[PDB]
Amino acid sequence: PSPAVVGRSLVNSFKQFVSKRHVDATYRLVLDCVAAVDPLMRLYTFGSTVVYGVHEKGSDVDFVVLNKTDVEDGKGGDAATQVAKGLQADILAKLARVIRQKHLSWNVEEVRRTRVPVVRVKGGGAVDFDITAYRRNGVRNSALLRAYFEQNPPCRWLSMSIKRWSKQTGLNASVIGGSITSYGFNLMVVYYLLQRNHLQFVPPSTIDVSRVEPLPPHLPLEEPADEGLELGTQVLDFLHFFLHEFDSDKQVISLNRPGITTKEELDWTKSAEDFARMNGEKVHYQWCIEDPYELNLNVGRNVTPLKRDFLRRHLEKARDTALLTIV
Ligand SMILES: Nc1ccn([C@@H]2O[C@H](COP(=O)(O)OP(=O)(O)OP(=O)(O)O)[C@@H](O)[C@H]2O)c(=O)n1
Ligand SMILES: [Mg+2]
């Protein structure tokens, strides 16, 4: 299809998303529980809610519980140690006890499979959220992607379109056999928009957690006023870029620098894979996405040679189906 047809199917697919801040009350409900553990402890919001400034249907909320001194140290990295991890699980255990006590109908899951300790909460009516502890990086990288989407608010449509597709096609980490998170696809979307000068480079070091809102304001979204021409033009060029312009053997998707970053300058090579192990397992350096804040973290670490295969196929197949909408 032409950019226009792609644009039109996309605006048409999002028709019921635009119909109907509502997160405040949940923030307050979560703050109740947090305060019964420690009334000096803070609650911060992060994820898509903060990144877009809109709360989507079928998205959880992301919360982190911070101490005063965790905030004031607004630019510290986050310790990747066993005691750090221990500390977070201990506080999260207490808070889970309290959440269960106060809300008997809620499922409160202490998730231990992961690299970052997390409590997953389903109350059963899209009351839906995760809680973490004592980490700045979630709030920090979310303010970074929010900084960019604010330079150019309509780009939130390209990213929302890519996100929904990733989940539909099973590429998204959230689906069985998926390899890239929603977070990784955003880093790809921004990286792309920066390469096309739709966005002005922001150094990740300029983001200060002590200057961020624990609950940031709503950021109005409006329909494309061109019957989605720019959306469809962006989408087609996005796919072209990651298909025929981005050189995955030699390059890294990164917001740490403007221009090109090579795998070679990072030591993200075959030799590194043999030495590697992350979260307990094999890291892959097939599809490279650099984390702006964490040391030596590839967000694309789960992209096996096979999943690199699937990804390209879908990038080819998305050109003709308008991200699975024109079918
Ligand atoms: N490897 C990762 C994955 C996620 N995050 C943090 O956790 C937040 C939530 O991640 P995710 O749920 O994947 O992204 P959302 O944009 O919230 O998308 P959705 O919830 O709609 O799937 C991200 O914004 C990011 O700051 C992170 O620091 N590192
Ligand atoms: Mg989320």
DSSP lists the bridge partners of residue 274 as: none
Kindly provide the resolution of this structure in angstroms, with one decimal: 2.2
Q: Reduce the DSSP state of residue 191 to 3 states and report it.
A: helix
Cα(264)–Cα(277) distance, integer angstroms: 19
Pocket test for ligand 1, best of 48, 278, 295 (most atoms within 8 A of CB): 48
- CA–CA gap between residue 301 and residue 308 (Å, rounded): 11
CB 174 within 8 A of CB 182: yes
How far is 327 from 321, CA to CA, in rounded Å?
Answer: 6
Q: Relative to the CA of 172, which ligand 1 atom is closest?
A: 22
Q: Residue 65 corresponds to which tokens in the numbers above?
A: 């519980």
What is the residue with the minimal CA distance to atom 21 of ligand 1? 59
**C-alpha separations of 238 from 20, 77, 212, 242 in Å:** 29, 31, 30, 6
In testing the pocket of ligand 1, which one of 183, 185, 279, 291 has its CB within 8 Å of the most ligand atoms?
A: 183
- Cα–Cα distances in Å, from 247 out to 40, 126, 163, 313? 49, 40, 22, 16
CB 298 within 8 A of CB 289: yes
| Residues in a beta bridge with 61 | 129
Q: What is the C-alpha radius of gyration for the chain, rounded to an integer number of angstroms? A: 20
Closest to 219 in 3D by CA, of 1, 23, 12: 23
Q: Residue 84 and residue 105: Cα distance in Å, rounded?
A: 31
Sign of CA pseudo-dihedral 33, 37, 42, 46: negative
The Cα-based distances of 152 to 45, 139, 156 in angstroms read: 22, 20, 8
- Residue 27, C-beta contacts closer than 8 angstroms, at least 6 positions apart: 43, 45, 61, 63, 215
For residues 282 and 276, what is the distance between their CA atoms, to the nearest angstrom? 6
Asked whether 230 lines ligand 1 (CB < 6 A), one says: no
Rounded CA-CA distance 295/113 in Å is: 21
Residue whose Cα lies nearest atom 12 of ligand 1: it is 47
The tokens of 107 are what? 């499922």
107-111/261-262 β-pairing: unpaired
Decide: 179 and 307 in contact? Cβ < 8 Å.
Answer: yes
Residue with CA at minimum distance from ligand 1 atom 20: 59
The β-bridge partners of 314 are: none
Is the distance from the beta carbon of residue 290 to the nearest atom of ligand 1 less than 6 Å?
no
Distance from C-alpha of 144 to C-alpha of 141, rounded to nearest angstrom: 5
38-45: long-range pairs with CB below 8 Å, 24+: 40/67, 40/68, 41/65, 41/66, 41/67, 42/66, 42/67, 42/68, 42/70, 42/71, 42/214, 43/214, 44/139, 44/212, 44/214, 45/139, 45/214, 45/215, 45/216
The H-or-E segment that residue 165 falls in is helix 155-168
Which ligand neighbours the alpha carbon of 178 most closely? 1
265 C-alpha to center of ligand 2: Å? 32
What's the token pair of residue 250?
């030699």
Q: Does the beta carbon of 120 sit less than 6 angstroms from any atom of ligand 1?
A: no
Query: What spacing in Å lies between the alpha carbon of 271 and ligand 2's midpoint?
Result: 34
Angle at 319 between CA 317 and CA 321, to 5 degrees: 70
Look at the chain and count its residues. 327
Which residues carry a binding-site annotation for Mg(2+)?
Answer: 60, 62
Q: How far apart are CA 163 and CA 133, in angstroms?
A: 26
Closest-lying ligand 1 atom to the alpha carbon of residue 60: 20
In the 3-class helix/strand/coil scheme, how is the chain assigned residue by residue? Answer: CCHHHHHHHHHHHCHHHHCCCCCHHHHHHHHHHHHHHCCCCEEEEECHHHHHCCCCCCCCEEEEEECHHHHHCCCCCCCCCHHHHHHHHHHHHHHHHHHHHHCCCCEEEEECCCCCCEEEEECCCCCEEEEEECCCHHHHHHHHHHHHHHHCCCHHHHHHHHHHHHHHCCCECCCCCCCECHHHHHHHHHHHHHHCCCCCCCCHHHCCHHHCCCCCCCCCCCCCCCCCHHHHHHHHHHHHHHHHHCCCCCEEECCCCCCCEEHHHHCCCHHHHHHCCECCECCCCCCEEECCCCCCCECCCCCCHHHHHHHHHHHHHHHHHCCCCCC
CA distance 207 to 313: 36
Give 164 Cα–ligand 2 centroid separation in angstroms.
13
Q: Please report the beta strands in the chain, taking only residues with DSSP state E, as ranges in sequence order.
A: 42-46, 61-66, 107-111, 118-122, 128-133, 251-253, 261-262, 288-289
Strands 118-122 and 42-46: unpaired
Query: Per the annotation, where are the binding residues?
Result: 48, 59-62, 115, 138-142, 163, 167, 182-183
CA of 173 from ligand 1 middle (Å) equals 11
* Residue found by looking up tokens 């967000």 in the block: 299
**Cβ of 289 below 6 Å from ligand 1:** no
CB of 131 within 8 A of CB of 63?
yes
Number of structural domains the chain divides into: 1
- Residue written as tokens 């890239």? 180
Paired residues of 191 in beta bridges: none
Distance CA 275, CA 298 (A): 14
User: Which ligand number lies closest to the CA of residue 174?
Assistant: 1
277, amino acid identity = R
Give the residue numbers spanning the domain of 128: 1-327
* CB-ligand 1 contact for 131 (6 Å cutoff): no
Q: How far apart are the first and last CA of the chain?
A: 11
